[PDB]
Amino acid sequence: ARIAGVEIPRNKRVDVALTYIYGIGKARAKEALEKTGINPATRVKDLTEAEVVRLREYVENTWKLEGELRAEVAANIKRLMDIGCYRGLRHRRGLPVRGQRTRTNARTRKGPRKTVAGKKKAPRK
Amino acid sequence: KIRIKLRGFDHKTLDASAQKIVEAARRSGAQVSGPIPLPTRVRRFTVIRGPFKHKDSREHFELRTHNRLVDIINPNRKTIEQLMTLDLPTGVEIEIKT
Amino acid sequence: PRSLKKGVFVDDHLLEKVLELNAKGEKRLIKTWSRRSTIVPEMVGHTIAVYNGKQHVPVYITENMVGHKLGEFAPTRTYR
Amino acid sequence: GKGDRRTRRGKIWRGTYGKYRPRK
Amino acid sequence: ARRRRAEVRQLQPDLVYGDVLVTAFINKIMRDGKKNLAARIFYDACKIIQEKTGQEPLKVFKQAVENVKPRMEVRSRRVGGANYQVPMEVSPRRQQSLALRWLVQAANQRPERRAAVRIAHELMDAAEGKGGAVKKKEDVERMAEANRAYAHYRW
Amino acid sequence: GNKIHPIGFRLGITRDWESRWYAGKKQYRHLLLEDQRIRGLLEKELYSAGLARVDIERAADNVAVTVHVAKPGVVIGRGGERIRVLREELAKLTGKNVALNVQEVQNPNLSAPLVAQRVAEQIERRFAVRRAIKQAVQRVMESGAKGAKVIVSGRIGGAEQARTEWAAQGRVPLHTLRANIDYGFALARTTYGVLGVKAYIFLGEV
Amino acid sequence: EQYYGTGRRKEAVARVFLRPGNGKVTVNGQDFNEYFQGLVRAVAALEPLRAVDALGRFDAYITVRGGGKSGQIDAIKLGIARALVQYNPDYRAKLKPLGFLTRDARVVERKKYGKHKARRAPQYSKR
Amino acid sequence: ARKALIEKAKRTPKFKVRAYTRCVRCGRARSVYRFFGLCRICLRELAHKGQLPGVRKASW
RNA sequence: CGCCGUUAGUUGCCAGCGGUUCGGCCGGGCACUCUAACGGGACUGCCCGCGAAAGCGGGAGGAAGGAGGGGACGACGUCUGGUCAGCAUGGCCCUUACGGCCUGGGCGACACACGUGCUACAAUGCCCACUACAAAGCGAUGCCACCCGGCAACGGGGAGCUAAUCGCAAAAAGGUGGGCCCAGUUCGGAUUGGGGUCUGCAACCCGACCCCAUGAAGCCGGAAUCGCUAGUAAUCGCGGAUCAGCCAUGCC
Ligand SMILES: [Mg+2]
Ligand SMILES: [Mg+2]
Ligand SMILES: [Mg+2]
Ligand SMILES: [Mg+2]
Ligand SMILES: [Mg+2]
Ligand SMILES: [Mg+2]
Ligand SMILES: [Mg+2]
Ligand SMILES: [Mg+2]
Ligand SMILES: [Mg+2]
Ligand SMILES: [Mg+2]
Ligand SMILES: [Mg+2]
Ligand SMILES: [Mg+2]
Ligand SMILES: [Mg+2]
Ligand SMILES: [Mg+2]
Ligand SMILES: [Mg+2]
Ligand SMILES: [Mg+2]
Ligand SMILES: [Mg+2]
Ligand SMILES: [Mg+2]
Ligand SMILES: [Mg+2]
Ligand SMILES: [Zn+2]
């Protein structure tokens, strides 16, 4: 059943399945199960309607998940850029932000490589 | 109950205490617990053999500190008089807390 | 995920120089070298000319940039 | 792995403590 | 080994069957020096063979290893142009080393999730004469005596 | 690169340290830095007396300071003028009452520190290297010594290309700890540049 | 009445005490199968006893200190062998041939510089 | 190093943070041991002249 | 480093015992372990085969055998090798600066490329819990026990230590039980958002750490290429030097 915004994890432990929800991770999961007394090991397909409702009414009225969360984050970074912020300019360039060395290994933040002229008449190492 | 600690960078110089202090009364006055060795804290200084590069060279230097306990119950009048100020070692330090 | 504890820091060079302009009016350019100072509410409106190691760049302070440091709005290195 | 901060071995390696590794 | 002839290092006999060959197999299974986890796997396999076969486990192991030993193999060698796979006997020392190694290798190719199950079913398949471990042996033998046109290069 | 200081290599045996005195982890660096201030000063003043090794000891806030020279005469001073002011400047650095002593060197031709200091003075004084060295080794070898060796660095003769001049006699088993080999080094500030001078003297075995 | 033997191995030391008894082994307070619980090697330590058809002829109180259970397993096997020769000197004609008496001297080789792990040398490229 | 820079014990360095070791024998500010006040080069030099009490060459 | 002995027992222990808050915690002996000073022990010494001899194969006694294992040690010299930015040092050049002083910036730039490494791609694994074993080292204007508050980083409190006598410490791989069930996954933890601790005059450029959220590439790597012969490789974790703190996944 749908716990969080359009969420349908089934055939798995509740505390694991819950993770598939956006803003929900291992912590929030095993936490929402304790504050609603739902045996974490139980499979979603084996949950009481009564239990699901509790989970639904809780997890949604306790945290800010899914799309609405993407919205805030998408919004936050956009804010960093609108103002002349530094981290902002970094987000514009697509370069690391948490002060990482960009002479090498900035791949994850730069996507596939953009190999161009790297040498011509000197040690090509 | 005489407790005297013995530090030092040389282990033969410290011995210039046991074979000198236990000569008062080992089987007459006090019992003299004798000089206990105790572990010896070692300090290593590892250094690159030469200036500039050559990280894989290095030479090792240690500054071994030796210890001694002694401890002698029965702070005898005459026994202390002798074992009072008749020493010789220069590379030894003493601590007293009997 | 920033952090400074409990005791927001700002260099009194301007901290005491700004609170003054709040006793008269605005002011054009306030060249400083203190990019350490966490911009405080009582600055919005003022135009602090932060230094970049080479020049003083004017940064109009807005409600939006409260807890941000003056340096963050004054880029240092020059890329393409 | 030793790279997971919020895990047991993650803290050991990084030589730290927290919810994922109390002191006792 | 340019100087010494190299001497085989005998190993401590088995702590069950007492067989030294058994220990050897366990060493191959062992990785990162986790001997306990290793043995805990081999013996776990002997249990899996006792229910699958009415015959004792050691009888199976012996058989398996034996089936997997190659009688002949080819060893590259330049003779005056390109490289030439020259067939030649395999010393008893090597037959053993290879059997055990291959056994453990094919073993970890099987789909079964539990390690012990992989070694067990693999040993059984070996004594039966089937199983990918016995294939390698067959393919290696098929390799030589398929180059008999060079066997006169003993080496 | 090769070849470790032959003393640093024997410090343990057949070569007692040059300053015996314990010192906790907190004071040591100080008591040590002081040794230098001292060893340095004396080394510059007592130059003409020609010193070998300034040994130093320490006690209940005390300081040995036993300078080993060949011309104690010049050390002491006339009736005690040299040996005077020295303890006046020494005790200033060390407010621990620094006694001071002077020892005689039983022949300065078995004192590598000197033999080297010798050849060095010759070179700074435009002498012919090969000869000074051949003589030095001789003198050393002349009075006992089961072996000896002298080495001068480069620019031998003011030349543009630096070189190294050998010269040695008897034995000098550097690879044996049980050797008791004295070692001495001396610069040689000249008009064209420096020139190292190392001196080795092999005396006694076990 | 009671026989002793030292026994050491690769940084492990264990005192062994044998007394004509049943067979229980009070290792560091716990039963044998309790201290070396689930380690296919333990049975080794007790091996020397089987060298002379003893085992149930003795009892053994053992205290270990230093190293790892496996290193200790061997140290223990050395005590159970010595304390046995003290019980009977003639218990060497058998207890020895199997080697049970030799003291395994292999030790963690020092860690040299310019090398990662003592011998394991760092790797390079152009060469 | 340069003489101008030699002055670690300059005292009152404004903030304890700006204070830095520096060799007492050569001015080297790059690998000065606390126990000796010296840099790794000098530590090697003097130790060879047994001028560092008790400091011997280790070996195990 | 490997075995034994002697000398010394505020480490040690039911050894045999008596007191147990049944913790070697008090008594108390130092036997054993250990600590460390010193000392013994192997020398082809003995037996057998071969040998002209040196010595080679093999055997016994022995902790150890024939260089028992690991170090320190590196010849005459070569590379006109490295370093005048450690330090000296000849020559040359600079003066109102090629000196000095600061605040700030830079050495942390990035379309690219390589070396060395870390962490992985998972089930002989990952997670959680309980529980057993080290060594070598560290403790001031420091190491910080059992206490309280906080999920926590850590904050307040405060004992002992001055350190074989207190602390750092929890060793980790391991073992026992449970979970996961082959999935880009309870594999991996990159990146990014948010909140916060601490060190520091100060963390924007440029710190480490904690918690929530996010959860990338990666399914074992082309040509080619590296280390290692035994307590070695591989694998696991611990300490230290530098050091306020830390970019150490480095070094020892
Ligand atoms: Mg080399
Ligand atoms: Mg070397
Ligand atoms: Mg002012
Ligand atoms: Mg994980
Ligand atoms: Mg001139
Ligand atoms: Mg190791
Ligand atoms: Mg200078
Ligand atoms: Mg600093
Ligand atoms: Mg003994
Ligand atoms: Mg009792
Ligand atoms: Mg002979
Ligand atoms: Mg040699
Ligand atoms: Mg750099
Ligand atoms: Mg709490
Ligand atoms: Mg399990
Ligand atoms: Mg692989
Ligand atoms: Mg690895
Ligand atoms: Mg540090
Ligand atoms: Mg570390
Ligand atoms: Zn220096």
Account of the protein in words:
Chain F: Residues 38-106 form the KH type-2 domain. Chain F: GO terms for molecular function: mRNA binding; rRNA binding; structural constituent of ribosome. Chain F: Belongs to the universal ribosomal protein uS3 family. The structure is cut from a larger assembly and holds 8 protein chains of 8 kinds. Chain A is built from 6 helices and no strands. Chain A is mainly alpha-helical. Chain A has 2 domains: 1-71, Orthogonal Bundle (Helicase, Ruva Protein, domain 3), CATH 1.10.8; 72-125, 30s ribosomal protein s13, domain 2. In chain A, helix 4 packs across helix 5. Helices cover 13% and strands 18% of the residues of chain B. Chain B has 2 helices and 4 strands; from the N terminus they run βαββαβ. The longest helix of chain B has 7 residues, at 15-21. With 155 residues, chain E is mostly helical. Chain E has one domain: Ribosomal protein S7/S5 (Ribosomal Protein S7). Chain E has a two-stranded antiparallel ribbon with strand order 1-2. The F-H interface holds F 4-5, 7-9, 11-12, 15-23, 25, 28-29, 32-33, 35-36, 39 and H 24-25, 34-37, 47-54, 56-57. Strand 3 of chain B pairs antiparallel with strand 1 (56-57) of chain H. Zinc ion (ZN) binds next to helix 1 of chain H. Residues 23, 25-26, 28, 38-39, 41-42 of chain H line the site of zinc ion (ZN). Chain G binds one RNA strand of 252 nucleotides through strand 3, strand 5 and helix 3.
Throw out a few tags for this protein:
part of a larger assembly; 8 chains; C: 80 residues; alpha+beta; 30s Ribosomal Protein S19, Chain A; two-stranded antiparallel sheet; 12% helix; H: 60 residues; mainly alpha; binds magnesium ion; RNA-binding
Overall structural domain count of chain C: 1
- Overall 3D geometry of chain A? elongated
How much beta of chain C, percentage-wise? 5-15%
Distance between the termini of chain C: 29 Å
Radius of gyration of chain A: 22 Å
CATH architecture descriptor name of chain C = 2-Layer Sandwich
Overall form of chain C:
globular
CATH level 1 class label of the largest domain in chain A: Mainly Alpha
Ligand types:
magnesium ion, zinc ion
Would you report the number of β strands of chain A? 0
The class by helix and strand makeup of chain C works out as: alpha+beta
In the CATH scheme, the class of chain C would be: Alpha Beta
Helix content of chain A: 40-55%
Number of DSSP strands of chain C?
Answer: 2
**Strand fraction band of chain A?**
under 5%
Distance between the termini of chain A: 57 Å
Q: What is the ordering of alpha helices and beta strands of chain C?
A: HEE
GO molecular function (chain H): rRNA binding; structural constituent of ribosome; zinc ion binding
Function (chain H): Required for the assembly of 30S particles and may also be responsible for determining the conformation of the 16S rRNA at the A site. Binds 16S rRNA in center of the 30S subunit head.
Family (chain H): Belongs to the universal ribosomal protein uS14 family. Zinc-binding uS14 subfamily.
Protein name (chain H): Small ribosomal subunit protein uS14
